[PDB]
Design an enzyme around this catalytic site. Structure first.
Site, PDB file in Angstrom:
ATOM      1  N   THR A   1      32.207  38.150  50.219  1.00 43.44           N
ATOM      2  CA  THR A   1      33.433  38.876  50.533  1.00 43.44           C
ATOM      3  C   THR A   1      33.126  40.159  51.292  1.00 43.44           C
ATOM      4  OG1 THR A   1      34.698  37.967  48.681  1.00 43.44           O
ATOM      5  CG2 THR A   1      35.376  40.105  49.536  1.00 43.44           C
TER       6      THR A   1
ATOM      7  N   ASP B   1      26.601  33.093  40.292  1.00 40.21           N
ATOM      8  CA  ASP B   1      26.516  34.434  40.864  1.00 40.21           C
ATOM      9  C   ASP B   1      25.706  35.367  39.972  1.00 40.21           C
ATOM     10  OD1 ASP B   1      27.885  34.000  43.258  1.00 40.21           O
ATOM     11  OD2 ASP B   1      29.840  34.330  42.327  1.00 40.21           O
TER      12      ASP B   1
HETATM   13  N1  LIG Z   1      33.074  48.549  37.515  1.00 37.22           N
HETATM   14  C1  LIG Z   1      33.075  48.795  38.845  1.00 37.22           C
HETATM   15  N2  LIG Z   1      33.508  49.974  39.336  1.00 37.22           N
HETATM   16  C2  LIG Z   1      33.515  50.230  40.655  1.00 37.22           C
HETATM   17  N3  LIG Z   1      33.102  49.355  41.586  1.00 37.22           N
HETATM   18  C3  LIG Z   1      32.643  48.134  41.235  1.00 37.22           C
HETATM   19  C4  LIG Z   1      32.605  47.777  39.811  1.00 37.22           C
HETATM   20  N4  LIG Z   1      32.116  46.528  39.739  1.00 37.22           N
HETATM   21  C5  LIG Z   1      31.863  46.119  41.007  1.00 37.22           C
HETATM   22  N5  LIG Z   1      32.179  47.075  41.896  1.00 37.22           N
HETATM   23  C6  LIG Z   1      32.030  46.968  43.366  1.00 37.22           C
HETATM   24  O1  LIG Z   1      32.591  45.738  43.816  1.00 37.22           O
HETATM   25  C7  LIG Z   1      31.744  45.121  44.782  1.00 37.22           C
HETATM   26  C8  LIG Z   1      31.576  43.654  44.429  1.00 37.22           C
HETATM   27  O2  LIG Z   1      32.721  42.929  44.857  1.00 37.22           O
HETATM   28  P1  LIG Z   1      32.669  41.327  44.831  1.00 37.22           P
HETATM   29  O3  LIG Z   1      34.037  40.791  44.500  1.00 37.22           O
HETATM   30  O4  LIG Z   1      31.461  40.924  44.026  1.00 37.22           O
HETATM   31  O5  LIG Z   1      32.347  41.044  46.378  1.00 37.22           O
HETATM   32  P2  LIG Z   1      31.166  40.040  46.796  1.00 37.22           P
HETATM   33  O6  LIG Z   1      31.530  38.757  46.098  1.00 37.22           O
HETATM   34  O7  LIG Z   1      31.255  39.986  48.298  1.00 37.22           O
HETATM   35  O8  LIG Z   1      29.919  40.710  46.281  1.00 37.22           O
HETATM   36  C9  LIG Z   1      30.409  45.838  44.749  1.00 37.22           C
HETATM   37  O9  LIG Z   1      30.137  46.397  46.035  1.00 37.22           O
HETATM   38  C10 LIG Z   1      30.558  46.949  43.734  1.00 37.22           C
HETATM   39  O10 LIG Z   1      30.170  48.192  44.324  1.00 37.22           O
END
Ligand SMILES: Nc1ncnc2c1ncn2[C@@H]1O[C@H](COP(=O)(O)OP(=O)(O)O)[C@@H](O)[C@H]1O
Ligand SMILES: Nc1ncnc2c1ncn2[C@@H]1O[C@H](COP(=O)(O)OP(=O)(O)O)[C@@H](O)[C@H]1O
Ligand SMILES: Nc1ncnc2c1ncn2[C@@H]1O[C@H](COP(=O)(O)OP(=O)(O)O)[C@@H](O)[C@H]1O
Ligand SMILES: [Mg+2]
Ligand SMILES: [Mg+2]
Ligand SMILES: [Mg+2]
Lengths: 528, 533, 527, 56, 53
Positions: C93, C393
């Site tokens: 994403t 994942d």
């Molecule tokens: N608890 C949280 N608080 C803030 N940001 C978060 C948290 N958990 C994940 N993230 C952010 O969300 C992003 C992950 O989104 P995600 O849906 O996994 O996208 P992708 O599948 O492309 O990795 C990461 O870049 C992370 O920085």
């Protein structure tokens, strides 16, 4: 039904005259104009959509032209010219099409008047001979033992491609692959980039991790988990025959009457497998590679001797492994000899990349084949990188076979054009005009470079011509990134003489071939 | 200025047959409406007064039932949110065997109240969090509502009384007789070992005499005839063979190689003598009934008739295994005579005719055995199918009672008490989750409301009386079905009790389905294309 | 019109600005769709196939595969995301979002008459500086259990519901730690993922053994073995035909019987060998013998083994040979010529579980299993699929965090710091490539923007608050998805894979540079 | 071969691999014969007097 | 998991890298008599595949 009297078929179409010549020339011009903008260090890439659903993103002329389907036979001839240029020297594919288009344009100029095509053809052939002479005159030699100059040549070859960002890595990979695949046997030298020096592209990772392997890598795994996946100094045995019991050629029905004959037959099948495995083991190897299947019982008997086995390997891959590790493929295991065992591979290792197993034999001493492992963003990026690496390897082989070198950046075009123009002043015939016209048609390369760079075509081209009128300015070309005149012995852009010779010859002969046609007949049945 | 072009971006890139629904109104409300419509379709078949439904599938097969799971299975549900709710109902049926209509009704009510909450201003996350909190509270409250336990499962009277409520919803008029039948069948099964097998109860449906003629047989009934001449045995000694009742043959290829006239003249005689010797050896062990899974040879049948052996051929391997289990024999892979331990035993095997059907009965005199068969009579195939579904519900209720013996009052009493307790809990919770908790509590009213609507009385009066009597302190009071006016009565004394595990799993699955449906924000549907299966 | 259309009349061609606009529009549409996926506060998507199968997911790669799209630029972006998922297993994403934002920021300047080549040069310089900064900012740490738990939580909370994510975090961390060997690459093929469809989604757990989707095929087999000797074999115990068209010939019924009895002696010899080994190892009745065969077992051999109290399984998975060898601890056998007790694995409990028609076998209580299994449980098929994707994942995330000695703070903090570093470095770049550097920084800033937007806060105010907090103190502060205030991702426990960030930078920059330089799109393969 | 509505058993995204396997599994597609990918051309076929002969 | 046909990917690989010269187009029949005398003529032992579209 109704019967119309006819000589030829209903679906037979015939046209002739000035219309046919004009149509051929405009078809060639359109083919040239399709890829006109894909030449030079500042070329722009194109997306080609396959009829099969694939996508080709490239600025190579041959791929773009081969992806286009055309109806006019002149365009088909031009595409065949592109393919011929690609297959012969592997470079100059975009230049030859533009040169052929320009030559056909300047020929059409005369055909509009009352000049017969044969006169134009004779003038073109005289001009081609003079171009060959001038190119051989202005060339300079290269020292193949000088690695720096070879790397510079490969770089100047690949500065016009998408891989130019990682220029040093690509140049080193191409040079190393060409050098190690170079072979000599029975007094016959060969390179053979087509068979060996395989390029394997695995999407993912970074392109800075791409490298040329000191050996061969294949997409295979051990036949059974108990096999060793890491051997320090393996002794490799290669086979084609299957390691399993198989039917004979002749019809060989059995007739069992006694009770024990069935179990006896099964026991002898097992014993035959064991005998084959023992014959293999007698050479005391560590790895066994087969182009065909290996039975489970064969795997067990090979394990008893602690031997790793890999099956169902392609013939080309097996030949590459043989060249890399210095082994000889053996069909009948009972005829194995000591010199057929491959010793020289300094490491064999099956490691997991992504979610797949890959077999590495990448520590060979003096290997004659290699795998170029390409890692990158996606499949299309890696395909373009592979095409660029193929161009680089072709250029390296051309330089190795012919150590003559020719200035680039349009300097050679202008030098040859000036020499031919000066020579044409002492002929005083009717062929002098087409001779001079096809001489000045070579200026389409510097003009295209200036146009793609975005500079002023007329002023720069006039200045370049005036400079080339001087006494030693044969190496003065155009800087394709800044749009300024520069000496190519300072810029450093040089090209093999073979590529230039092939480009000029192919362009002139394409013009000659398309200038000989005045009648077109189409629609008739193939009759066969 | 006559046409509206597609918006640049995803709208133009979408395929020709694809559909894209995004946002609250476009996705969540449509899903809630579809689930509400499905619940409305199934609603009118809830409780003892639930009417039957005639459902004809795509193969012209006719179903007459009030079982929610069967109706949903035979319906061609196309909306995918309702598809998820149907999966939840089917999972409830698989896990417990009863309460599918409860799952559907509760999910529909939850989604309707979720739509109301979303409309008044709450977000999807708040509604989901409140629903989960209220589900946890309900699961905590439920063990305290248990009124009585089974406390005995080997007693016919107790098991019949326990299963009467389970099989009163289907076939309301005549539930005592079916309860007695299923109780006897289940008590035959379920030995001293605590394990109980649902498969060990077989149902045979034969037309002709009305369901009041149904009976329970300690054994198995097969709708077929006998191969031989013997049709009745009084001291059966069944020997069961998985191999065909014929001479064994090679596996590769068999060729009779004849090289002299003597071999040609002696081959058939030797083969017949071998067959006779094998059948005589089988009969010499005392076996008088032989059951085979394959075909029966003519010579083998002739020699079985000669030695007075009853032959029964069973095509299904499952039937052969069940017969071995219910008789006590081992399916021999060859035609060797059975050893003493491998020989089966049965009190009587005979050929009989029930109605116009020829059957073979393996009958045990003792009220024991591993497999019991319920012979269902009736005047229509659909009626017997419905009775079989009711029998399945009763057997599943018995299995649940074996797993957990705790019971909670039925007739909406448990639902009303849960609603009251959850409302009281949510009234003490500050924050935006109190609205969702109160709506979750209110969703429990759909069960007594549906019961009252099917019974033909006013639901509002029934619910008001239920709240009044529960605030008084009586938690075992539900609506009186056998009344022409809204009335309530205690069901601990009436015996209208339903299992604790059924309620627990139904609540859990309905809440999970509702939350999962609520979680969806965007829907991308491909072109329907084909794929018949 | 164009040159191509003259040679091929029915050819679809987009030239120069047209091609660039087509590519940017496709990228922006993909970005618009996949914006809502990012972050733990993202919205679940609902995918219905042609056959009608329901799939609920938030994964970028899954959504890309399941959208009904027929665009070439979408195909290229899908290939890039597929490579991302295949290698790193995360960040698809973010990959799509960064590609789309890079293209949009580039078009912001290209529409002002700027040539795309300058933008690509700026992109290359900014990518180099960003890689240097990322190498500077990574947090090298000893990968204890707590750090792996934090990484697995940071992935699974985005993938699934908070409580299910909490369960799956412990599951995946324990599974990875069980099969990990010191200073050796982690083989993820040794963690079996098995789906069961009877319990709730929170009942999924980790079994320190193996679960087989098949059971014993003989009714008299034992349903539970306490102390089990495991025999993993790849030998066919069913009837086998002669390879050379044997056939039988007899002259009497007795001869036929003798030939029938004597034709099974080959398999009976191997069954006798197995039975003799079983009688040797366990002369008493307490210990059990379990035979797992990759090949088939005919009913005769099944009965012969059952009569000796041996439970046997047939037609096992090929990978199950290695899995059982590593878990139980025996030796997988391709023949029974020389079988000894040292080749027998040991399992402390083997029992059979039945779920409807489907049949399962559990092998547990191993000594020190190097291959474990994850039992996915749920009431729906789509729930099982979603949990399987989330587990994939999480396993990839933990494996990456172990292979890399470092870990990068999440919540967009690294993106904000990297953008600030790029802005500071911009004056050092000579020429008009500073515009490309600025575009690259703005594109990098998309992650905190989308995180704040998904969480419901104001995009610009939250972004400027984060940037001001970062500039004031220099800390790696990210977006708090609950309050919108700046938060130190490292202190809270929000972690990102360093390899994922590096691959994101490399792939996004390469694909954006290649797309920007495309000036002509053709489809001229017909006629 | 009487294949109608091949999209039912092939779909809408079937590749050449799917069609090749689908035709092979009914045994209608002729077996694959290995051949030279590309080479130089000869283009001659017997005729008469095409025979070098020893001088005598 | 041999049924998943990993070999399908590499089948596509060398089907894509099949040949060098032009790949030609599928022959198009323009008249019903064209189809009739195409099937009626030509060698009998050679398979002819027609795609109605
Ligand atoms: N608890 C949280 N608080 C803030 N940001 C978060 C948290 N958990 C994940 N993230 C952010 O969300 C992003 C992950 O989104 P995600 O849906 O996994 O996208 P992708 O599948 O492309 O990795 C990461 O870049 C992370 O920085
Ligand atoms: N840095 C440079 N400056 C000027 N001209 C260059 C430079 N690099 C390459 N060229 C010119 O570009 C041409 C190569 O263009 P290219 O895209 O490879 O077309 P082709 O494939 O037909 O050779 C060469 O003739 C060379 O003279
Ligand atoms: N005699 C009765 N009086 C009042 N309520 C009853 C009676 N029998 C059953 N019920 C109620 O009917 C409900 C069962 O409805 P039913 O049609 O079985 O749906 P499901 O099959 O989904 O459980 C139970 O909750 C029970 O409380
Ligand atoms: Mg070139
Ligand atoms: Mg019920
Ligand atoms: Mg992620």
């Amino acid at each position: 039904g109704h019967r119309p009297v006819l000589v030829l078929s209903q679906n037979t179409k015939r046209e002739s005259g000035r219309k046919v010549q004009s149509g051929n020339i405009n078809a060639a011009k359109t083919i040239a104009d399709i890829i006109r903008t894909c030449l030079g260090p500042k070329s722009m890439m194109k997306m080609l959509l396959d009829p099969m659903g694939g996508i080709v993103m490239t600025n190579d002329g041959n791929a773009i032209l081969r992806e286009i389907q055309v109806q006019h036979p002149a365009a088909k001839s031009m595409i065949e010219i592109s393919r011929t240029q690609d297959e012969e020297v592997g470079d100059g594919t975009t230049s030859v099409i533009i040169l052929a288009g320009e030559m056909l344009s300047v020929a059409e100029h005369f055909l509009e008047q009352q000049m017969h095509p044969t006169v134009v053809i004779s003038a073109y052939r005289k001009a081609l001979d003079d171009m060959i002479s001038t190119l051989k005159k202005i060339s300079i030699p290269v020292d193949i033992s000088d690695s720096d100059m070879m790397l510079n040549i490969i770089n100047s070859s690949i500065t016009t491609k998408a891989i130019s960002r990682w220029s040093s890595l690509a140049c080193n990979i191409a040079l190393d692959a060409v050098k190690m695949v170079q072979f000599e046997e029975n007094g016959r030298k060969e390179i053979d980039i087509k068979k060996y020096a395989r390029v394997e592209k695995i999407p993912g990772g970074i392109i800075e991790d791409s490298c040329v392997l000191r050996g061969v890598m294949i997409n295979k795994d051990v036949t059974h988990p108990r096999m060793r996946r890491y051997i320090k100094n393996p002794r490799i045995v290669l086979l084609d025959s299957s390691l399993e019991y198989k039917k004979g050629e002749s019809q060989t029905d059995i007739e069992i009457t006694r009770e024990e004959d069935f179990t006896r037959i099964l026991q002898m099948e097992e014993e035959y497998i064991q005998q084959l495995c023992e014959d293999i083991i007698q050479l005391k190897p560590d790895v066994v590679i087969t182009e065909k299947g290996i039975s489970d019982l064969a795997q067990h008997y090979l394990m008893r001797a602690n031997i790793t086995a890999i099956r169902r390997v392609r013939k080309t891959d097996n030949n590459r492994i043989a060249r890399a590790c210095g082994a000889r493929i053996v069909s009948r295991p009972e005829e194995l000899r000591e010199d057929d065992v491959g010793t020289g591979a300094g490491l064999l290792e099956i490691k997991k990349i992504g979610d797949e197993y890959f077999t590495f034999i990448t520590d060979c001493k003096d290997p004659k084949a290699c795998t170029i492992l390409l890692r990158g963003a996606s499949k299309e990026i890696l395909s373009e990188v592979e095409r660029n690496l193929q161009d680089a390897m072709q250029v390296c082989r051309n330089v190795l076979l012919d150590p003559q070198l020719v200035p680039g950046g349009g300097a050679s075009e202008m030098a040859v054009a000036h020499a031919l123009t000066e020579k044409s002043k002492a002929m005083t015939g009717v062929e002098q005009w087409p001779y001079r016209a096809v001489a000045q048609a070579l200026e389409v390369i510097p003009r295209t470079l200036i146009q793609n760079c975005g500079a002023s075509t007329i002023r720069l081209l006039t200045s370049l011509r005036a400079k080339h009128t001087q006494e030693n300015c044969e190496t003065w070309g155009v800087n394709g990134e800044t749009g300024t005149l520069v000496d190519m012995k300072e810029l450093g852009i040089w090209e093999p003489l073979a590529v230039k010779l092939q480009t000029y010859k192919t362009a002139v002969e394409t013009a000659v071939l398309l200038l000989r046609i005045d009648d077109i007949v189409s629609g008739h049945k193939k009759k066969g | 200025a006559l046409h509206v072009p597609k918006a640049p971006g995803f709208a133009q890139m979408l395929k020709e047959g694809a559909k894209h629904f995004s946002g609250l109104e476009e996705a969540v409300y449509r899903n809630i409406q579809a689930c509400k419509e499905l619940a409305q379709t199934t609603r009118t078949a809830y409780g003892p007064n639930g009417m039957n439904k005639m459902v004809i599938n795509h193969l012209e097969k006719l179903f007459v039932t009030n079982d929610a799971a069967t109706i949903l299975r035979e319906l061609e549900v196309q909306h995918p949110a309702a598809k998820m709710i149907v999966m939840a109902s089917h999972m409830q049926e698989q896990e417990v065997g009863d309460g599918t209509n409860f799952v559907l009704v509760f999910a529909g009510a939850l989604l309707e109240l979720a739509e109301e909450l979303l409309r008044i201003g709450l977000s999807v996350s708040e509604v989901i969090e409140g629903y989960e909190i209220a589900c946890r509270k309900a699961h905590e409250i439920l063990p305290n509502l248990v009124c009585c336990s089974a406390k005995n499962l080997r007693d016919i009277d107790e098991v019949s009384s326990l299963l009467r409520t389970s099989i009163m919803s289907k076939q309301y008029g005549n539930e005592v007789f079916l309860a007695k039948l299923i109780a006897q069948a289940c008590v035959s099964i379920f030995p001293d070992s605590g394990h109980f097998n649902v498969d060990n109860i077989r149902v045979c449906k034969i037309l002709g005499s009305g369901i009041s003629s149904s009976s329970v047989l300690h054994g198995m009934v097969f709708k077929k005839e006998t191969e031989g001449d013997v049709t009745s045995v009084k001291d059966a000694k069944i020997a069961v063979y998985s191999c065909p009742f014929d001479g064994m043959i090679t596996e590769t290829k068999g060729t009779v190689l004849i090289k002299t006239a003597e071999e040609l003249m002696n081959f058939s005689k030797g083969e017949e003598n071998l067959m006779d010797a094998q059948v005589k050896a089988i009969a010499d062990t005392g076996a008088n009934v032989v059951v085979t899974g394959g075909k029966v040879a003519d010579m083998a049948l002739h020699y079985a008739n000669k030695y007075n052996i009853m032959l029964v051929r069973l095509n299904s391997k499952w039937d052969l295994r069940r017969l071995c289990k219910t008789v006590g024999a081992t399916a021999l892979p060859r035609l060797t005579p059975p050893v003493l331990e491998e020989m089966g035993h049965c009190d009587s095997v005979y050929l009989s005719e029930v109605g116009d059907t020829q059957v073979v009965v393996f009958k045990h005199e003792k009220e024991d055995g591993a497999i019991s068969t319920i012979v269902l009579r009736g005047s229509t195939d659909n009626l017997m199918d419905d009775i079989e579904r009711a029998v399945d519900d009763g057997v599943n209720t018995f299995k649940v009672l074996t797993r957990d013996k705790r019971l909670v009052p039925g007739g909406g009493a448990t639902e009303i008490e849960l609603a009251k307790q959850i409302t009281s809990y949510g009234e003490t919770c500050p924050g935006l989750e109190q609205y969702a908790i109160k709506k979750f509590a209110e969703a429990f009213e759909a069960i007594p409301r549906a019961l009252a609507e099917n019974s033909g009385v006013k639901a509002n009066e029934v619910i008001s009386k239920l709240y009044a009597v529960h605030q008084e302190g009586n938690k075992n009071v539900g609506l009186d079905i056998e009344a022409e006016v809204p009335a309530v009565k205690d069901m601990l004394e009436a015996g209208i009790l339903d299992t604790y595990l059924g309620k627990y799993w139904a609540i859990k699955l309905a809440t999970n389905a509702a939350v999962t449906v609520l979680r969806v924000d965007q829907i991308i549907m491909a072109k329907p294309a084909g794929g018949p299966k | 019109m164009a040159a191509v259309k003259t040679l091929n009349p029915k050819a679809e061609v987009a030239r120069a600005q047209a091609a660039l606009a087509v590519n940017i529009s496709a990228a922006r549409g993909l970005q618009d769709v996949l914006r809502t996926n990012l972050g733990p506060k993202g919205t679940m998507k609902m995918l219905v196939s042609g056959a009608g199968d329901i799939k609920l997911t938030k994964d970028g790669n899954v959504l890309l595969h399941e959208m009904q799209i027929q665009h070439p630029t979408a195909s290229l972006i899908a290939k890039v995301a597929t490579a991302q998922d295949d290698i790193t297993g995360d960040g698809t994403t973010s990959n799509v979002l960064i590609i789309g934002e890079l293209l949009k920021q580039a078009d912001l300047y290209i529409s002002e008459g700027l040539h795309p080549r300058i933008i690509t040069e700026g992109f290359e310089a900014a990518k180099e500086k960003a890689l240097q900064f990322l190498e500077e900012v990574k947090v090298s740490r000893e990968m204890d259990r707590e750090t792996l738990i934090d990484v697995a939580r940071t992935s699974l909370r985005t993938k699934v519901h908070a409580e299910l994510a909490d369960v799956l975090t412990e599951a995946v961390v324990d599974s990875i730690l069980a099969i990990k060997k010191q200073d050796e690459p982690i083989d993820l093929f040794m963690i079996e993922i098995m789906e069961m469809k009877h319990k709730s989604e929170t009942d999924t757990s980790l079994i320190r053994g193996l679960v087989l989707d098949h059971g014993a095929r003989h009714p008299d087999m034992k349903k539970r073995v306490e102390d089990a000797y495991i025999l993993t074999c790849n030998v066919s115990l069913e009837y086998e035909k002669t390879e050379v068209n044997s056939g039988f010939f007899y002259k009497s019924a007795e001869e036929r019987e003798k030939l029938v009895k004597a034709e099974r002696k080959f398999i009976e010899d191997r069954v006798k060998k197995i039975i003799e080994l079983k009688r040797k190892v366990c002369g008493d009745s307490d210990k059990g013998f379990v035979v797992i065969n990759q090949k088939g077992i005919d009913p005769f051999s099944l009965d012969a083994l059952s009569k000796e109290g041996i439970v046997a399984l047939r037609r096992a998975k090929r990978r199950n040979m290695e899995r059982l060898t590593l878990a139980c601890g025996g030796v997988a056998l391709n023949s029974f010529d020389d079988l000894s007790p040292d080749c027998l694995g040991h399992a402390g409990l083997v029992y059979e579980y039945t779920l409807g028609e489907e049949k399962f076998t559990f092998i547990e209580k191993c000594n020190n299993p190097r291959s474990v299994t994850l039992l996915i449980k749920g009431p729906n098929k789509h729930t099982l699929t979603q949990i399987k994707d989330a587990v994939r994942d999480g396993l990839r995330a933990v494996k990456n965090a172990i292979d890399d000695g470092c870990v990068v703070p999440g919540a967009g903090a690294v993106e904000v710091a990297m953008a600030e570093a790029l802005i500071k470095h911009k004056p050092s770049v000579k020429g008009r490539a500073q515009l490309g550097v600025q575009a690259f920084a703005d594109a990098l800033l998309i992650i905190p923007k989308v995180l704040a937007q998904n969480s419901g806060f104001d995009l610009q105010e939250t972004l400027v608050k984060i940037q001001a907090e970062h500039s004031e103190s220099g800390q790696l502060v990210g977006v708090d998805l609950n309050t919108g205030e700046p938060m130190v991702a490292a202190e809270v426990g929000v972690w990102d894979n360093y390899c994922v960030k590096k691959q994101l930078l490399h792939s996004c920059t390469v694909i954006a540079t290649n797309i920007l330089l495309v000036d002509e799109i053709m489809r001229a393969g017909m006629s | 071969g009487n294949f109608v509505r091949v999209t039912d058993q092939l779909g809408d995204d079937f590749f050449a691999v799917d069609l090749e396997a689908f035709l092979q599994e009914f045994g209608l597609l002729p077996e694959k014969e290995v051949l030279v990918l590309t080479s130089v051309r000869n283009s001659a076929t017997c005729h008469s007097e095409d025979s070098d002969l020893e001088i005598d | 998991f041999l049924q998943q046909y990993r070999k399908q990917r590499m089948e596509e690989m060398r089907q894509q890298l099949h040949k060098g010269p032009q790949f030609k187009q599928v022959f198009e029949i323009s008249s019903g008599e064209g189809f009739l005398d195409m099937i009626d003529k030509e060698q009998k032992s050679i398979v002819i595949m027609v795609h109605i579209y």
